[PDB]
Symmetry: D5
Subunit: 186 residues, 10 copies
């Protein structure tokens, strides 16, 4: 349970401090709206994201699985402004241990819903999968645009950041990485 | 000069309140970074945006000028989260009073650099142009994506908001409005 | 409070009736999953979708607002299979009554979360807006693909259905309707 | 022969249970429509999909054949909601045994017309080909969007699942797999 | 029931006449395959396409409905070679009479499944809708590529033929036609 | 010389057999039109397609030549319905035996102008080039859509079939094949 | 019959005059090749292009027919270098007089196969249609790129020239012209 | 003839003044290179842009001619930095006076080859055409990107400026302007 | 110096020989226009293309440089009709010898401005770069459309010819060739 | 602090020398505007671009990070005219040393804000990243259009120059380079 009233009070202080009128009609509810938003976008601070893979797995299957264009969003920890884009998750199941698709997506969301670095989301999702799924390998790629960069002095809209994490077989098998990348293009 | 320290204190309170560890390496400078960011993105609170048109050029031309796909960003006043996209600005000069292209962009930026509604940015830019350029008419269209919407519970990425403001000749000449809209399509 | 157990029993009957083995591993949890899904996608049956506009902002703004590409999904009432696409909502505020963007999206979602016709979603959204925003006018357009049609006998993938509802000023002002349509193309 | 009446009764129970009015005009025929739909989309439960290859053409051609962007749809067995996209099927004929294109498509359709996992459709198609075509190798790739995921709480529209099955020469020849993937991009 | 054997005999004659060897492996079954194909693509000769309407529900709904990008194919009556593309069907319901979307598609198919002129398919579909739906108006547009043209001496691949039929209100209201055309672009 | 009258008679029989009125205005000339069309599209039955290379130009150039997006059409031998698309031809010349571009196209056309399998067109073009040009290697890729599949019960519009044939150096040099494939994407 | 030898002698003179060696291997046959090419591309000098409409189809159809993206090429009369692109032809049939598609294309080709101005091709095609089809109106649009301009003098590759001719109803009905233009833009 | 040496001396002074080393390898030849560049890009200062408009008579060449996507570049007179894009020129011939297409392009180039405002290039081109062609009307549109704006502090890459000039019939006939705009979109 | 009058006399002979009226208004100046055109497009016959190739010196720079999408045009030596498209030039500088961009383009133009084969342009540009830059290697790719093929009997518009030449390191390093190809796609 | 007056005097001399009237309204302030512009775009002459590298430490993160489509602009040192496009920067962090994204962009800008060669910007950025981040390797690619080439006699708009620099692991690992290139295309 987040203390929304405490956050709201801080937001009000911020608004006064930047030279705004916190009592004007457009801002009256902003403090609480910001609080509610933080509650939602930082909910992952209160959750172990690995729990979604504590579940019964899907019917046995032994070949590459790739789930691509999984939308995500997060907040840069440096500036607390959103960054957003897609994640692509590929892996080689071992002994038929396959992840429910919606569980995958929940991991990405849960890891994301806290102040982050894209790099840390990428590796964490890869680590959780290695831990919980014990596959022959995993490859995670994330692609995102950072407002940290679009709205600020630097002002570079259209810049995409791309992170990747390879574990297990994907670390040593370039042909496999290469196939994943080809399948992700389309 | 805004009180950055005061803002930083409030941000720290927010980080504790959401359940984060404000002393961890990735957050230690976040309070001050957010304060410096707010100083930059809300600088417009301290500026008259109309000053950029205190220099206008006198060459004699009476026909339509459209500047399209001017990038902008701002922060929704409801949630203090960025929205960003493009502005298109069209006007009918008279007495050859023409706006420098960079001056136009500065007006858009200055109006934008405060907590805003897209609607209000749109009309303000239009009003400033009527006041300072005294053209036969102006038409302003803005197109933007709101993170207010993409990162929150509602979760609708790809939603675009489009606003417009017409003044002078554009208000009564539908053919003219129509031509502008065709030229903006591209 | 939906009787999920009852639904699950009916689903199990359906699975037997189509010639499946409801006791096979891949189907054992299907009855309850379907029940939980129905609870979610038909939640709108228990909600008044108009409540989201019980809070409205007063600004001094009188010009066109268009929110386009709002993703939605629903279930055809004929076949209980999903249809999905986008809604575009345009309105002319009256007396500065402006809708929060997220409130708009919520209305679309809530109206959508029940067995539907696309036509009815379109008009209902429009009606709710006229009633709760009291704008000069509203125009709602929806564009969607129906699985009723992609998977089933007609087998016409790629077919899009487009519905519209105009009220108030949009009903009588063809120029205005025309401008909305141009802005929606881009 | 499916017991449609039994299904229709169960659907009526479901409609009552979710809080709908089964007697309203839009729903009166829904129970039977759903029954007829299930009879069609699950027809594959009554068919051997391998019969379509009981006719094969013998012309000494030994090189790669790829049939790409074969539309398919199916119903997830977990939620009985459609998933749909494209299948790509590549094979290396052996002794000039070539598949009729329409026979290929029929196999995909027939395997699909039952409650499924994408993975199982992929491998089943591949197995049927190896068995009935006896080619040097087969590669099957499927790309699909699951409504299981777009309409439910998880709410991740745009997410694509990609499955693959390689047999014979495609299992050991990475260059060949690579060429197929290039030809599928375009 | 058509006389497939008769057709097969004629096809065999055609194959001998063009200098082919009707006994070679690739052609042995061609006569009967062509017969079965004609039975399917010319099935409309045995059917009344008007029987599919009206699946008319009552809504209280008076606004435009457009179903676009309905795939169709037919055979030119001049050369018995396929032409194919899309149909777009728009109407203004009267007294809340709405057409099932799939019923619309079936009408297009049925009218199409016979030797045709694109022009005739277009008007026939429009007439059937006026007769059976009794709407305020209908507009039908078809867009297609003719192999009559792509494979023959003239050899103009990429040529599209576009036909239209307007009835009722669409005949007199250019604004309405115009809106339909805008919605069909996209 | 083809016996057009004999073909026309057979076409008339086919029209009666399918339940059409052969004497209606749109069909009266169809029998002879179809005969003249068959004369044209099956002209290749009377031609040696290799004669176009009884002509070569000695330049002493040894590097890759690729002619891409050569339009072709043909008739499936299984159903006598058109298929059409593009051919790409690449080769490594040897001793100034470069092929005139129009001579290449003529070979494709000539091989195509008879009842065919896409596979056979692909290999035949490749064989003719090896025989007549004696290059270090050849690679032929064809991409086409089959009406065999778009207009019939299977009904899969947008399906493309891709065939290839490699000879000489292209058979052993995967890097070379790969480069060709890259150059064909653009 | 044209005097190819005379042309070949003139071409040889041209080659000498520009400082080329007419006896080198690549040019030996060029004079006769250019003669044969001129015989083909200027064949329209010997043909009445109107004869293709001496056969008309009668069916009582009165609505708009548009044939778009008809490829053509011609030679500028100013420089004898090719220009090429597409023609779009729209007409309103009168008393059911409809043009065969291939006949239309032939007219465009025949008018084109002589030294031309794009403007003249456009009006000539329109005039022939009014004369031979006696429709309520015709609209012809041509779009082309001129090598007159890409290789020589302006050196402006990508420049398109667009010409139009309206007759009959299209001359007076701007809504109709407008609809044609919309249908051409897809 | 320009005094290049004088320009080169001034450029060298500029390089010293900005803190650069004019003797370093990369700058040694820069002063003369800048001089030669100015000679080329400002050559229009020494020419009468036209100055060269000869026409030919064609019959019922009274209809619209549009030359679109004419590439141009120029230098802003405010900053002496390039701007570039396309010009579109449309006119209604009078009495069959047609412009050579390349002559049009030359006029654009020549007017462009001097320090400019986009507005002035636009009107000048329009005026020259009215004076020298005496058409019923002319419409000129230019679309360009200004480096004045992409490289400087304002920093707005992607911004396009669009100017237009209408004379004669285009000034009073909105339908005509509209048709031009539609044809320019494609 | 070219003898333009001699060429003009030969062109006039050609025009009479093809059955044209050389005294009609559109053709009166054509002989001289064609002469002036040949003077321009064959100017390379009088020029050494290597002579203006100057290098730029960047000390120690050794990494890949690619200049892509360099427009060129030329005339096929077989038919004297234009072909045009793009050249891509990649090289590995040695010891910091780098090519000025405009110098590169000039070499391409100069080699092109004579009757050519695409292959010969390709290798010649490669050779000149080995000679004048002495790089570690060069790769040249050209992509063009030939009117030799679009306007003639063969009639295959859209056909692209692609040539390549590799020297030095690009000859033995397939990875490097591959990277160039990837960079050219975009 | 650069001597703006000196620069302004030189610019005035340049304007006279090219044949312009420096006293005309549009040019009066140009000299000083150019001076102020040079002060801004060449500000990098006074800064060390390596100072911005405040790396961030994330844990032990060792996997690929790519920041792509970073907009940049600079001035060619040869002609002092802008070139602009994108930079892509990829690196393999060592010991968790990661670069702030905005810091990366600042380095690109600072290196760019001086007369440059694209090649030198590319290597300098790469060097700075090796020095300051000490990663396992870096790859920098830049893609730009040069006005040096678009506005001048050579006149080749659309030409892109692509430069690269590889250090550390990217120098020896072609698979890695290849993966970066794929991710940049995407």
């Amino acid at each position: 349970q987040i203390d929304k009233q405490k956050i709201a009070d801080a937001v009000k202080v911020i608004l006064e401090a930047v030279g705004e009128n916190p009592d004007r009609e457009g801002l009256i509810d902003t403090p609480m709206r910001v609080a509610r938003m933080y509650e939602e976008v930082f909910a992952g601070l209160k959750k172990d994201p690995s729990v979604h893979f504590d579940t019964i797995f899907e019917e046995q299957h032994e070949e590459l699985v790739l789930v691509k264009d999984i939308r995500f969003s997060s907040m840069c920890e440096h500036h607390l402004v959103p960054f957003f884009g897609v994640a692509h998750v590929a892996y080689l199941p071992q002994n038929g241990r396959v992840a429910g698709l919606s569980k995958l997506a929940r991991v990405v969301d849960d890891v994301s819903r806290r102040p982050q670095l894209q790099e840390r989301i990428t590796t964490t999702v890869a680590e959780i999968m290695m831990e919980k799924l014990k596959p022959l390998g995993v490859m995670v790629i994330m692609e995102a645009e950072h407002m940290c960069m679009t709205i600020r002095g630097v002002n570079k809209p259209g810049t995409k950041t791309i992170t990747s994490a390879v574990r297990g077989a994907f670390k040593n098998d370039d042909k496999l990485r290469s196939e994943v990348l080809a399948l992700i293009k389309h």
